[PDB]
Amino acid sequence: MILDTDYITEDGKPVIRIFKKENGEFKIEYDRTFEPYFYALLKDDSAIEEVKKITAERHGTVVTVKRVEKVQKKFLGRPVEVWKLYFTHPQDVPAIRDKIREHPAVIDIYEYDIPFAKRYLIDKGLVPMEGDEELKMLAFDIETLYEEGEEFAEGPILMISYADEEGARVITWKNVDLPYVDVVSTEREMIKRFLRVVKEKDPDVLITYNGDNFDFAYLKKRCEKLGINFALGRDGSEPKIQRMGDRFAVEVKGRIHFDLYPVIRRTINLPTYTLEAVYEAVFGQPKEKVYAEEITTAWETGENLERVARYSMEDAKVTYELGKEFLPMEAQLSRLIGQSLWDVSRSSTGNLVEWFLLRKAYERNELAPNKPDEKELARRRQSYEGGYVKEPERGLWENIVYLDFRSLYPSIIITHNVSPDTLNREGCKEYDVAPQVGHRFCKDFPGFIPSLLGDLLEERQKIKKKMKATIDPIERKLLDYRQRAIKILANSYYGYYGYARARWYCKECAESVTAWGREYITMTIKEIEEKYGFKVIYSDTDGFFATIPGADAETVKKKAMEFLKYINAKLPGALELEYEGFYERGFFVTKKKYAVIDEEGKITTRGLEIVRRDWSEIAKETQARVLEALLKDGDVEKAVRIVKEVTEKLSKYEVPPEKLVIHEQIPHVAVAKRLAATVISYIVLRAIPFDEFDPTKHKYDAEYYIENQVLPAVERILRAFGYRKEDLR
Ligand code: NI
């Protein structure tokens, strides 16, 4: 199985390295055959002689043009004849590219900024992460001794935790004595231990959490002061640091630094991304967080280390588990795109698409256009985004169904063969003209992008077919990922067309796919109504909600499945429509804000969450009261009554005590600081909570929990009357 590829330099010439793991153990394949190169568009195949003489200077040596050969390729369908220029060393290209592009007999140059290593992959047509190869994984994390003054990495590293398929274990110097804490000498010895564990367990993947910006950088500054060789490299090298915009990224040659943060940030949606926050949001279990402030003054005093150790041990036990959750998909994304898992894992969809098209270009012999120059790059970002979500049909509805197009946006691209190499193609006998915007897209020959999309959608169909018939979960979940990557890849093309740095940028395509989207949806929203007595409830690109006023949950469903067959045999080939689900009751409030309930309970809803970190107090409880009364009970004059019935209680000082202790932390520092010369509840009326305020015969609350908690929570959901009658008099 190919893990990755990189190149070393020997005698001035580049030597490619293929890191892999075949039937059991590590192994590097070397190849010094591959040659660097890039393209050039010349005014006349004559000046090739004036050009093959141009030279540059790198490292005080001299960069020359090795060999050269003319070739024929397909630049956006249209025939092109360019010269392929070969060089001796990858770092030659970047030192002479502009010099060659600046020549007079040169109109333009192409494919001159592609990581030599990646290039090799697309040419030899090698695909990483393939075959049935089980990679050994190891998770590690570290907690250090902090101090606000500290410049950086000043304090020493207290522990190094590591989880495996065998368990977690922590390595620290001071004493603890727990079955899971390893004995070492000093800080220097600890780091040394870890190192000896890694080289020892010889893992294929090193998993960390934000270890791209913290763990490695630290371990570096510490390995320097302590005079140690951090040889995690499968070759003996030390992690190599890299640029990633405003942040950084760390490699470990021969292995795979699978940092979970960038991957988790792209997948799950949350307002806070602490490991504890994450773990919770992923497996539904609580995570105990121990803060530095506490750690510092815990490893010094004496013991509390049994606590810091646990927190440490877990940090790594959690990271490992999350590792197995998110690596599988990102690993299939790899195999689908044709690049390292290291790369794909730290990549946005636009690039995942850019790597696909670059590879597919090589196969199809299509010359790739170039990336945009700053002037243009900026110009593209200036575009206007104007979402279109028809307004919700205010009110409560029953026996609602949801229908969404099976791959809407990709279906259009295919159906209407939308692509930059078909846009404004003169001399065609056939064309499709995007609604509104009116872009002419020649249908004569299938366009590049669309051609690819078709295959992709086709195969994922193949997969889903073979996936509803296998039984063996390992042979099913296996496939399950494949078709999810394909789906992920596909829905990524629309955005890619507008992604300002896209080689295959196409604003016209994007505009078109949007306009068609509208048209198609709208045509359905209408066709279902006038011909099937449905009343479109809510709607947003992709799908929509609907029902037939007053109709058994069966009639609606029976009438539903009917419509599908109708417009389906109606609409194009790709464009198809499917039954999403059924929600016995629900109401809608503005854009992406609503709530529904299925036939077996369960309140989905996603419309208007906006929690308060903790349960806030009474709000996070009466919130449910209402919703449940609105959906399940379906009693409008009840949930609102539930408010006026509670506003006549809390203001009257009746609602329990602990049900007011706002579980928050970091006025704000009122009671907070009011305990001086980490976190703690409070039930002011500016006042702290304990057995000192509430005698149930002297102290009470305040009239805020009614206008700053209970009320503001349901005020929105409650759509019909103003809160002027939610307090009652
Ligand atoms: Ni950490």
- Half-sphere exposure at residue 57, Cβ-oriented, CA atoms within 13 angstroms: 2
351: CA distance to ligand 1 center in Å?
28
179: CA distance to ligand 1 center in Å?
22
197 membership: H or E segment, kind and range: helix 187-201
Strand-pairing partners, residue 8, are 15
Cβ–Cβ < 8 Å for 207, 137: yes
CA–CA gap between residue 684 and residue 550 (Å, rounded): 50
Helix, strand, or coil (residue 250): strand
- Which residue do the tokens 């568009």 mark? 41
277: CA distance to ligand 1 center in Å?
13
Query: DSSP letters of 508-556?
Result: HHHHHHHHHHHHHHHHHHHHHHHHH--EEEEEETTEEEEE-SS--HHHH
Q: What is the side-by-side order of every strand in the sheet holding 256-259?
A: 181-182, 167-172, 157-164, 137-144, 205-208, 256-259
CA–CA gap between residue 170 and residue 707 (Å, rounded): 49
135: CA distance to ligand 1 center in Å?
23
Closest CA to 172 of 143, 214, 196, 197: 143
Helix-strand-coil split of the chain, %, nearest 5: 35, 20, 45
- Which residue do the tokens 């979940």 mark? 477
**Rg, C-alpha atoms of the chain:** 31
CA–CA gap between residue 493 and residue 408 (Å, rounded): 12
CA–CA gap between residue 537 and residue 542 (Å, rounded): 14
Q: Are residues 265 and 205 in the same domain?
A: yes
321 membership: H or E segment, kind and range: helix 305-337
Q: Are residues 615 and 668 in the same domain?
A: yes
Residue at a domain's end among 559, 591, 606: 606
Strand 167-172, strand 181-182: pairing: parallel
Structure tokens at 218: 């630290």
Q: Are residues 205 and 301 in the same domain?
A: yes
315: CA distance to ligand 1 center in Å?
7
666: CA distance to ligand 1 center in Å?
20
Helices and strands: H and E segment counts in the chain: 22, 23
1: CA distance to ligand 1 center in Å?
30
What's the reported resolution, in angstroms, to a tenth?
2.8
Q: Are residues 635 and 595 in the same domain?
A: no
Q: Are residues 600 and 630 in the same domain?
A: no
209: CA distance to ligand 1 center in Å?
6
193: CA distance to ligand 1 center in Å?
18
Query: DSSP letters of 590-658?
Result: STT-EEEEETTEEE---TT---BSB-TTTHHHHHHHHHHHHTTS--HHHHHHHHHHHHTTSTTS-S-SG
**Could you tell me which residues come within 8 angstroms of residue 687 by beta carbon, excluding any fewer than 6 positions away?**
671, 693
Inter-CA distances, 174 with 153, 182, 218, Å: 19, 10, 20
**Could you tell me which residues come within 8 angstroms of residue 381 by beta carbon, excluding any fewer than 6 positions away?**
500
Query: DSSP letters of 446-457?
Result: --HHHHHHHHHH
30: CA distance to ligand 1 center in Å?
36
Instruction: Give the angle subtended at the CA of 138 by the CAs of 132 and 139, to the nearest 5°.
Output: 130
Q: Are residues 364 and 383 in the same domain?
A: no
Strand 78-86, strand 68-75: pairing: antiparallel
Structure tokens at 689: 């909570």
Query: DSSP letters of 362-391?
Result: HHTTPPP-PPPPHHHHHHHHT-------PP
In CATH, what number is assigned to the domain containing residue 200? Answer: 3.30.420.10
Closest CA to 120 of 27, 16, 32: 16
CA–CA gap between residue 262 and residue 285 (Å, rounded): 22
Cβ–Cβ < 8 Å for 496, 453: no
Instruction: Give the angle subtended at the CA of 19 by the CAs of 13 and 22, to the nearest 5°.
Output: 140
Q: Are residues 657 and 634 in the same domain?
A: yes
Q: Are residues 569 and 653 in the same domain?
A: no
669: CA distance to ligand 1 center in Å?
28
- By CB atoms closer than 10 A (0-12, 13-18, 19+), residue 522 is middle
662: CA distance to ligand 1 center in Å?
29
274: CA distance to ligand 1 center in Å?
10
Q: Are residues 418 and 397 in the same domain?
A: yes
Neighbours of 308 (CB within 10 A): 23
643: CA distance to ligand 1 center in Å?
45
142: CA distance to ligand 1 center in Å?
5
CA–CA gap between residue 309 and residue 380 (Å, rounded): 51
Q: What is the side-by-side order of every strand in the sheet holding 601-603?
A: 535-540, 543-547, 396-405, 577-588, 594-598, 601-603
Strand 256-259, strand 205-208: pairing: parallel
Cβ–Cβ < 8 Å for 190, 172: yes
Structure tokens at 456: 């992709």
Which amino acid appears at position 374 of this protein? E
Under DSSP, the state recorded for 301 is T
CA–CA gap between residue 531 and residue 549 (Å, rounded): 15
Inter-CA distances, 606 with 327, 395, 588, 626, 714, Å: 27, 17, 11, 16, 15
141: CA distance to ligand 1 center in Å?
5
Instruction: Give the angle subtended at the CA of 431 by the CAs of 425 and 435, to the nearest 5°.
Output: 110
Q: Are residues 245 and 299 in the same domain?
A: yes
Inter-CA distances, 222 with 152, 157, 218, 228, 230, Å: 10, 8, 6, 8, 10
Q: Are residues 122 and 138 in the same domain?
A: no
Cβ–Cβ < 8 Å for 257, 239: yes
144: CA distance to ligand 1 center in Å?
9
Instruction: Give the angle subtended at the CA of 291 by the CAs of 287 and 296, to the nearest 5°.
Output: 140
CA–CA gap between residue 119 and residue 86 (Å, rounded): 13
Cβ–Cβ < 8 Å for 255, 342: no
Q: Are residues 285 and 162 in the same domain?
A: yes
In CATH, what number is assigned to the domain containing residue 468? Answer: 1.10.287.690
Query: DSSP letters of 24-91?
Result: SSEEEEEE-----EEEEEES-TTTHHHHTT--B-STTS-B----EEEEEEEETTEEEEEEEEE-S-TT
Inter-CA distances, 547 with 400, 403, 544, 585, 606, Å: 5, 11, 11, 10, 20
Residue at a domain's end among 581, 606, 631: 606
CA–CA gap between residue 644 and residue 722 (Å, rounded): 12
**Could you tell me which residues come within 8 angstroms of residue 21 by beta carbon, excluding any fewer than 6 positions away?**
1, 3, 27, 133, 135, 204
CA–CA gap between residue 129 and residue 329 (Å, rounded): 11
CA–CA gap between residue 83 and residue 45 (Å, rounded): 8
Q: How many residues does the chain have?
A: 729
161: CA distance to ligand 1 center in Å?
9
210: CA distance to ligand 1 center in Å?
7
CA–CA gap between residue 331 and residue 137 (Å, rounded): 13
Closest CA to 266 of 150, 388, 348: 348
- Which residue do the tokens 């205010």 mark? 394
292: CA distance to ligand 1 center in Å?
11
Structure tokens at 465: 């077919």
291: CA distance to ligand 1 center in Å?
11
118: CA distance to ligand 1 center in Å?
31
327: CA distance to ligand 1 center in Å?
18
In CATH, what number is assigned to the domain containing residue 426? Answer: 3.90.1600.10
CA–CA gap between residue 501 and residue 650 (Å, rounded): 56
278: CA distance to ligand 1 center in Å?
13
- Residues before each break in the chain (C–N > 2.5 Å)? 666, 677, 685
Number of structural domains, the chain?
Answer: 5
293: CA distance to ligand 1 center in Å?
15
> For 4-17, what is the HEC assignment?
EEEEEEECCEEEEE
Cβ–Cβ < 8 Å for 410, 490: yes
603: CA distance to ligand 1 center in Å?
35
640: CA distance to ligand 1 center in Å?
47
Largest CA distance in the chain: 101
316: CA distance to ligand 1 center in Å?
8
143: CA distance to ligand 1 center in Å?
6
Inter-CA distances, 32 with 17, 319, 356, Å: 9, 39, 25
- Half-sphere exposure at residue 305, Cβ-oriented, CA atoms within 13 angstroms: 20
Closest CA to 184 of 193, 167, 176: 193
339: CA distance to ligand 1 center in Å?
27
3: CA distance to ligand 1 center in Å?
25
Q: What is the side-by-side order of every strand in the sheet holding 2-10?
A: 2-10, 13-21, 26-31
358: CA distance to ligand 1 center in Å?
36
In CATH, what number is assigned to the domain containing residue 98? Answer: 3.30.342.10
Determine the structural domain holding residue 126 and report its residue range: 1-130+348-368
162: CA distance to ligand 1 center in Å?
11
CA–CA gap between residue 682 and residue 689 (Å, rounded): 5
Residue at a domain's end among 315, 347, 379: 347
CA–CA gap between residue 7 and residue 14 (Å, rounded): 6
CA–CA gap between residue 526 and residue 546 (Å, rounded): 11
Ramachandran class of 491: left when φ > 0, alpha when ψ lies in -120 to 50, beta otherwise: alpha
Structure tokens at 472: 């063996």
Instruction: Give the angle subtended at the CA of 264 by the CAs of 285 and 278, to the nearest 5°.
Output: 25
Inter-CA distances, 448 with 30, 38, 77, 355, 452, Å: 34, 21, 8, 15, 7
CA–CA gap between residue 603 and residue 600 (Å, rounded): 9
